[PDB]
Amino acid sequence: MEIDPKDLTFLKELGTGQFGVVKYGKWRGQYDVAIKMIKSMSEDEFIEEAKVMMNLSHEKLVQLYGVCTIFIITEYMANGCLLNYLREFQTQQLLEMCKDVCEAMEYLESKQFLHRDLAARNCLVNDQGVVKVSDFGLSRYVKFPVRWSPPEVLMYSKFSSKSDIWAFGVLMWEIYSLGKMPYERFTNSETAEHIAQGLRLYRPHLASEKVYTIMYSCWHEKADERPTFKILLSNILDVM
Amino acid sequence: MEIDPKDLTFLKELGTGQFGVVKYGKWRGQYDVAIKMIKEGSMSEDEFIEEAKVMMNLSHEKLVQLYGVCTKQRPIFIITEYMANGCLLNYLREFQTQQLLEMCKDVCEAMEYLESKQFLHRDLAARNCLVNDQGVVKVSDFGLSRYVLDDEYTSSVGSKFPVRWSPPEVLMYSKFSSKSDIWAFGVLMWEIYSLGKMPYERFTNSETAEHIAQGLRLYRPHLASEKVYTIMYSCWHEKADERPTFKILLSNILDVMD
Numbered sequence A: 001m002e003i004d005p006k007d008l009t010f011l012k013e014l015g016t017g018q019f020g021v022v023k024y025g026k027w028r029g030q031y032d033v034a035i036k037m038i039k040s041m042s043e044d045e046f047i048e049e050a051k052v053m054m055n056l057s058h059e060k061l062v063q064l065y066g067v068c069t070i071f072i073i074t075e076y077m078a079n080g081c082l083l084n085y086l087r088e089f090q091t092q093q094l095l096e097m098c099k100d101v102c103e104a105m106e107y108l109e110s111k112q113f114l115h116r117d118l119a120a121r122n123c124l125v126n127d128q129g130v131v132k133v134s135d136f137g138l139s140r141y142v143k144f145p146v147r148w149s150p151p152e153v154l155m156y157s158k159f160s161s162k163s164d165i166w167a168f169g170v171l172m173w174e175i176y177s178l179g180k181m182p183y184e185r186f187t188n189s190e191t192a193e194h195i196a197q198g199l200r201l202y203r204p205h206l207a208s209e210k211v212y213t214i215m216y217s218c219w220h221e222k223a224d225e226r227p228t229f230k231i232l233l234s235n236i237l238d239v240m
Numbered sequence B: 001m002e003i004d005p006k007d008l009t010f011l012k013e014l015g016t017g018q019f020g021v022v023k024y025g026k027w028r029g030q031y032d033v034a035i036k037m038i039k040e041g042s043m044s045e046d047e048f049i050e051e052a053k054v055m056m057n058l059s060h061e062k063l064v065q066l067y068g069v070c071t072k073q074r075p076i077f078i079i080t081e082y083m084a085n086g087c088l089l090n091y092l093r094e095f096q097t098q099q100l101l102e103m104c105k106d107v108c109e110a111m112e113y114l115e116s117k118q119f120l121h122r123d124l125a126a127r128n129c130l131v132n133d134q135g136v137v138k139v140s141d142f143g144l145s146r147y148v149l150d151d152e153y154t155s156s157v158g159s160k161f162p163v164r165w166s167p168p169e170v171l172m173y174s175k176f177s178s179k180s181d182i183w184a185f186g187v188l189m190w191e192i193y194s195l196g197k198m199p200y201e202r203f204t205n206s207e208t209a210e211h212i213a214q215g216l217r218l219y220r221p222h223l224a225s226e227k228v229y230t231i232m233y234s235c236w237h238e239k240a241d242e243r244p245t246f247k248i249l250l251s252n253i254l255d256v257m258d
């Protein structure tokens, strides 16, 4: 659980996010790790949920290795952000990326754990091109995420497994559009108002009819009519 | 430099550019503004934000004024002076020869100012010039192309690169200078005097570079007199050093009007 900082080396800077800088390093002189040096956070509240997060273990989830309490030590993902990877592929590889994320989300759904900010910017890519979900449940300890939010979140702040489903459909669109920003011609407030009245993302060029039916199923105005991640995974597996 | 988005209203869409949708709006409930949304992923934002400090201080009556930026949330916005007659190219296509020379003068005065501040436009063309309610032409989006992430816009061989407004040193070597803006200005004068024809119509982007490499140039528009053509043609010298400066061009334009 607790890692001693004397067992970490702080090498190349990888990038900057909401909580600060993330660096590449070595743990115990041998393992590649990403060290999130938190500047910005309700730390006491995070430290209590970190045990629950340590126990979330799935091959398509970026693994938390430990904490320095502050630093969050995680699995190193050599191809960085999915959004960067998509902007810098065969249709079969794009569906595999959706599958990877869906498997991670079906696991979080099975553990009653909400991501709360699912988007391609929170997905990472390893040296083998496997996509994994990162920063799950971290936003609770902190306008642009309006573009990944269903109407019940925008109007009522009602977060559930069905609000992560909506975000997942937008993520599938981000994958199939090769990293376009969703709702390119609308501001954050306009997105919010226009999706509540029926605006949905268009079908990307690279998405087949069956692929669009799966992402579109995520955007039902009624949360109860949206599928679950078990159903989405099954549908993705049937298409490939 | 920072504008709180609570002080902006985002009204009609004007069009779409390289970075995204441009909207008309109001600032502090009273001032007309253009709000240029920068789609996330389309710009090198950190480098733009540092040059915005320099762009705030570029102030001239024939330059579309930068009023501020909204960078605390994505997508970021660039707030500028509102130009009610929109694009010069649209204005030309929808005039006495004296008014055409006055439009060249307006642009030349803005460019003489950017030249005096060592600031390169990098994408001068009638599509980047705007027209206000009084018919005054102003230069917009100066220095913004340096922050575009799409290589199709940025490389001299790219499909969206402005080859038709570029001198040979830009096309061959990516050498931008005050003299590459001078070349673009001559093409802009031709766009004005031809009433908004696309330069080198019936030439693809790569056939245009070859035409330039053979020492060929845009023909004289029939609305252009001999003296007007000598001014635009002076901008297209194969040698950058032999091209005039904007002070000289302005002086020549002022002499032709007299």
Ligand SMILES: CC(C)(O)c1ccc2c(c1)[nH]c1c(C(N)=O)ccc(-c3cccc(-n4cnc5ccccc5c4=O)c3F)c12
Pocket (backbone or CB within 6 Å): A014, A015, A016, A017, A022, A033, A034, A062, A074, A075, A076, A077, A078, A079, A080, A081, A083, A084, A121, A124
């Ligand atoms: C070596 C490489 C490929 O340059 C790279 C780059 C970043 C990272 C990287 C490798 N590996 C990780 C890991 C990890 N666990 O290994 C965790 C977080 C980050 C990371 C940290 C901050 C910001 C982003 N970030 C966020 N949004 C973006 C939207 C568009 C384009 C890039 C980014 C973009 O790098 C990050 F990805 C990175």
Ligand SMILES: CC(C)(O)c1ccc2c(c1)[nH]c1c(C(N)=O)ccc(-c3cccc(-n4cnc5ccccc5c4=O)c3F)c12
Pocket (backbone or CB within 6 Å): B014, B015, B016, B017, B022, B033, B034, B064, B080, B081, B082, B083, B084, B085, B086, B087, B089, B090, B127, B130
């Ligand atoms: C109300 C009116 C006259 O319809 C109008 C229209 C556009 C604009 C406008 C007013 N005012 C501005 C301002 C500003 N600062 O006020 C800045 C940018 C744009 C603008 C934004 C995107 C694309 C173009 N654009 C680009 N190239 C063209 C080639 C041919 C014909 C039209 C266009 C053509 O509108 C734009 F002009 C506009």
